[PDB]
Design a protein around this motif. Sequence first.
Motif, short mmCIF file in Angstrom:
data_model
loop_
_atom_site.label_atom_id
_atom_site.label_comp_id
_atom_site.label_asym_id
_atom_site.label_seq_id
_atom_site.Cartn_x
_atom_site.Cartn_y
_atom_site.Cartn_z
N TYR A 146 53.43 66.87 36.82
CA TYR A 146 52.39 66.03 37.44
C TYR A 146 51.53 65.35 36.39
O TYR A 146 50.76 66.01 35.70
CB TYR A 146 51.50 66.85 38.38
N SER A 147 51.65 64.03 36.29
CA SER A 147 50.87 63.26 35.33
C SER A 147 49.38 63.37 35.59
O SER A 147 48.95 63.70 36.70
CB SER A 147 51.29 61.80 35.37
N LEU A 148 48.59 63.09 34.55
CA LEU A 148 47.14 63.27 34.60
C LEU A 148 46.51 62.56 35.78
O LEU A 148 45.58 63.09 36.39
CB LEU A 148 46.52 62.78 33.30
N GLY A 149 47.00 61.37 36.10
CA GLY A 149 46.45 60.60 37.20
C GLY A 149 46.44 61.32 38.54
O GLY A 149 45.53 61.12 39.36
N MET A 191 40.49 67.41 31.54
CA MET A 191 41.72 67.93 32.11
C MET A 191 42.85 67.87 31.09
O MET A 191 43.62 68.82 30.96
CB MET A 191 42.11 67.17 33.37
N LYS A 192 42.92 66.76 30.36
CA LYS A 192 43.95 66.60 29.34
C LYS A 192 43.82 67.69 28.29
O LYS A 192 44.81 68.31 27.90
CB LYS A 192 43.87 65.23 28.68
N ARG A 193 42.59 67.93 27.84
CA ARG A 193 42.35 68.94 26.83
C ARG A 193 42.78 70.33 27.30
O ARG A 193 43.25 71.15 26.51
CB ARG A 193 40.87 68.95 26.44
N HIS A 194 42.63 70.60 28.60
CA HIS A 194 43.00 71.90 29.15
C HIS A 194 44.46 71.99 29.59
O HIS A 194 44.84 72.92 30.30
CB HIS A 194 42.06 72.25 30.31
N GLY A 195 45.28 71.03 29.16
CA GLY A 195 46.72 71.14 29.34
C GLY A 195 47.29 70.70 30.69
O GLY A 195 48.42 71.04 31.02
N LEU A 196 46.52 69.93 31.46
CA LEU A 196 46.97 69.53 32.80
C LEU A 196 47.89 68.32 32.83
O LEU A 196 48.63 68.14 33.80
CB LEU A 196 45.77 69.27 33.71
N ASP A 197 47.86 67.47 31.81
CA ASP A 197 48.65 66.24 31.83
C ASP A 197 50.13 66.60 31.76
O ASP A 197 50.57 67.25 30.82
CB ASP A 197 48.27 65.31 30.68
N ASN A 198 50.86 66.17 32.78
CA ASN A 198 52.27 66.51 32.99
C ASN A 198 52.57 67.99 33.21
O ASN A 198 53.73 68.40 33.06
CB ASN A 198 53.10 65.97 31.84
N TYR A 199 51.56 68.78 33.58
CA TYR A 199 51.80 70.19 33.90
C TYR A 199 52.65 70.31 35.17
O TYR A 199 52.29 69.77 36.22
CB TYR A 199 50.49 70.94 34.09
N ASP A 201 31.73 74.00 33.34
CA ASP A 201 32.94 74.22 32.54
C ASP A 201 34.13 74.38 33.48
O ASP A 201 34.17 75.32 34.28
CB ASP A 201 32.76 75.48 31.68
N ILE A 202 35.11 73.49 33.39
CA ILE A 202 36.20 73.51 34.38
C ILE A 202 37.34 74.46 34.04
O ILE A 202 38.34 74.49 34.76
CB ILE A 202 36.82 72.11 34.58
N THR A 203 37.20 75.22 32.96
CA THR A 203 38.30 76.06 32.50
C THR A 203 38.86 76.98 33.61
O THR A 203 40.07 77.03 33.82
CB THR A 203 37.90 76.92 31.30
N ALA A 204 37.98 77.67 34.33
CA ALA A 204 38.44 78.60 35.36
C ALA A 204 39.16 77.88 36.48
O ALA A 204 40.15 78.38 37.01
CB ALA A 204 37.26 79.41 35.93
N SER A 205 38.67 76.69 36.84
CA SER A 205 39.27 75.91 37.92
C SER A 205 40.65 75.46 37.51
O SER A 205 41.60 75.52 38.29
CB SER A 205 38.40 74.71 38.27
N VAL A 206 40.74 75.01 36.27
CA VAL A 206 41.99 74.53 35.71
C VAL A 206 43.02 75.64 35.61
O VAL A 206 44.17 75.45 36.01
CB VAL A 206 41.76 73.89 34.33
N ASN A 207 42.62 76.81 35.10
CA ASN A 207 43.57 77.90 34.95
C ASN A 207 44.10 78.36 36.30
O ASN A 207 45.28 78.65 36.46
CB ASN A 207 42.95 79.09 34.22
#
Length: 129
Positions: A23-26, A12-20, A87-93
């Motif tokens: 909202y912190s990664l946790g 998730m961090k790699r895909h830019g979600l941390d503090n997106y 691969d979580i990319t689609a879910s993340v985007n």
Amino acid sequence: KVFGRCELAAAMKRHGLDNYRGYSLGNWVCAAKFESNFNTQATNRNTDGSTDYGILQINSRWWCNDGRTPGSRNLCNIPCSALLSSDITASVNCAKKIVSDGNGMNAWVAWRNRCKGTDVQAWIRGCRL
Ligand SMILES: [Cl-]
Ligand SMILES: [Cl-]
Ligand SMILES: [Cl-]
Ligand SMILES: [Cl-]
Ligand SMILES: [Cl-]
Ligand code: NA
């Protein structure tokens, strides 16, 4: 694929979600835990006939096309099956679009009921990030 806790955090961090959107990664790891138990293949049908898909249980009424939710939208422009990939990319985007739409992470009922207002940082404690 069933992710490990720290394994998913790193992805998730790699895909830019941390503090997106603040909202912190946790928060994201907590939501994935209680939505899908970290299983990319999770599906659940809702009473209105829509279905939730994948690690963040994204709903077919608005966000993806599964060919069986009449009068639904496809706002992430993807087949819902793409959300079940290892691969979580689609879910993340797609999640980035959801969380940006005004209601933040309150769109995920499990986050609201089980993560919001808790020590969510505990979900990434001990991980090498
Ligand atoms: Cl955190
Ligand atoms: Cl069917
Ligand atoms: Cl449909
Ligand atoms: Cl991944
Ligand atoms: Cl917000
Ligand atoms: Na749809």
